[model samples]
Target: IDQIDLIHDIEHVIQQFPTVRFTFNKNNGQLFLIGHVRNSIDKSELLYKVDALSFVKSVDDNVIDDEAVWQEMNILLSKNPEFKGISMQSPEPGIFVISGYLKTEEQAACLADYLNLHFNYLSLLDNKVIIESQVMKALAGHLVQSGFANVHVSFTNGEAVLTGYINNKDADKFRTVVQELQDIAGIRAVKNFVVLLP
Candidate 1:
């Protein structure tokens, strides 16, 4: 039948992504994209490509989004001992973002692979998570070594904020500290609530 040739043509168009799978209701010329893809952009691109094909009349997306994926992901991470301190959110349909800390980069790699294996159809944004206590220790050492007095530093979401006071004569310390904090790898931004001693 002509359906075999048309199905082959459609599959050929999508051969580049082995993870993407679908079903066709040839009678109605409607296609159902099953499972998921990397992200929304990929999903859109896939849909547009299929829509342009000769035999495709409509696309009914049965693929699950990141929200649904996260429900299962949350259950996966919540119980795992290695996933301690890891938190996540789905800010949009296909994007899954992870934040907070893990013990090591290798652990994070495992987490990524695990997610990839489990949720092969999702996009992961992982810049939010870090090696946690290492950054804290690293920053403390840096602040101490820089000899910045009176101003204490703290962090949230990889942003470092300085508080307390810097001596007026030593005001240069604030600028120097800010610049130093800026150079550190994991700290995204540095801000201060530092008061100057008069």
Candidate 2:
């Protein structure tokens, strides 16, 4: 086949791929391919078929490894219920991106923490991922609902501010409640503005 038919036949093999960029040379009779594909098998299989044609000197490989590591991590995550709703991606080997939502910040961080111990990269979570909060409104509303009388709590930045008046017993009750909530994430400290009554 001449250069025209030769490159046409080569294009047929690459058509199996989603879409790969190709370069051709009629003089030296060479072909160049570049793009991203799933794994090493995609690399081997595509090249094998491409070389099957004549008038091609060699195939220049520029396909970067995509979703190889990502798929592996996703399968492992499937084994654990904690990993639910969490999604992962590997743009290239050894680099990863994680996004998704869960009940708490700790739940969201679990994948990244584990992956860090093993392998992970790129963007873990920034504004894209939801860590979860409203913590201020939710907790404040909960306190009122939980039978605390005349106590107000406001969260500003990371601090939990407590105010209003209550009996001495309820003062301690509120104290212990804040103590437990301190164990949670995002809360830095508690500022007590709650006045105690006799």
Candidate 3:
């Protein structure tokens, strides 16, 4: 079996004391933190800490430690233990390209919006469109209205590459979603790469 490596560096980054606690059970990780300290720590800080953990593959802040929430997470993890870890890779920003015979331009935009909303953080760098099919043209209208930032969805030649900014934390998720896009019948694979922020 492949070794699942994870590292989390929450010790120094988090300002509070041992207020934050972590547990790895059945390959799923859960964090317990004092919720009352809304003063010193903010939600973004906590999220950054969670994402910072090196060994921690993925984090689902969705789990709250309250007794009431425990049962909910317990029930969820019991059935799907794999839900604990977050996938590691995702598309990166630089030049984005997509190719497929979308039912219509409207459908393409819907798909793009779905991608943008579902993976907003990863797509933040800069969006570009090399070539967009007719369906994708229609999709662009809605995609912009929905606030899919910096995305340039277009077509080029016979293939497509969706490139955008991808953080180290989201690399795996990027790869997986692109794979899904490629799997659609008549749609060629979407290639992606990460470009650092200037």
Candidate 4:
């Protein structure tokens, strides 16, 4: 069978076992499989069938060792100086845990993007990282940078209160920007009180 068919068959078999997270690739006439299995019995059964495939070269176990993942994350985080303020730990295998204080929402968002890019799963604990006033100001600065110079921003109890003036025609645009700010990590709510100018 072709590689496509082989991969499809592998996926079909994997689907029958709901607890497995599997990824398969074909390289140099051999199939490479990497994933996690919840139990040893399932692992044994999986290996037996995988070995039966004619194109299979080898099968490797993907045991979730929390410390090992934690070490790897630390090494990666250290290599990037921009992410220094962010702290990470792997309390459980396959779960990326993050906390610590960041200077701006941009920085926090960047850290989240970096983790998501490198890890399959993440859990952001509550108040693990406190957002300083500079973060709120930076978010306001972002609005100014985006051309909404009249908008004033403040933070209270994790909510952003926006007050300012813009042309009536630009009210919708201002509202959209305020709404988008709520998507940022650590921002619980956004209150837009921008007045419309003539």
lDDT of each: 0.70, 0.67, 0.41, 0.63
Each candidate's number of clashing pairs is 0, 1, 36, 0
Model 4 agreement with the true structure over 43-151: per-residue lDDT tens digits? 6676677667666666655534445555677678667766665566644323446665565667667766787698544542222665646658667877997779988
Highest TM-score: which candidate?
A: 1
Residue 40 error, candidate 2, Å: 1.7
Which one wins on lDDT? 1
Tens digits of lDDT, candidate 3, 42-134: 444666766666555565553222233223323543343322221122132112233323334454455456445544233322322222354
Question: Which wins on TM-score, candidate 1 or candidate 2?
Answer: 1
Candidate 3, position 150, lDDT: 42
| Model 1 global lDDT (CA atoms, 0 to 1) | 0.70
Descending-lDDT candidate ranking:
1, 2, 4, 3
Query: Model 2 over residues 26-83: C-alpha lDDT tens digits?
Result: 7787888876566778777888888877778887887655667667767887787776
The per-residue C-alpha lDDT of model 2 at residue 137 equals 60
Model 1 clash pairs? none
Candidate 4 positional error at 114, Å: 27
- Model 2 segments beyond 4 Å from truth? 1-4, 69-87, 90-97, 100-128, 134-198
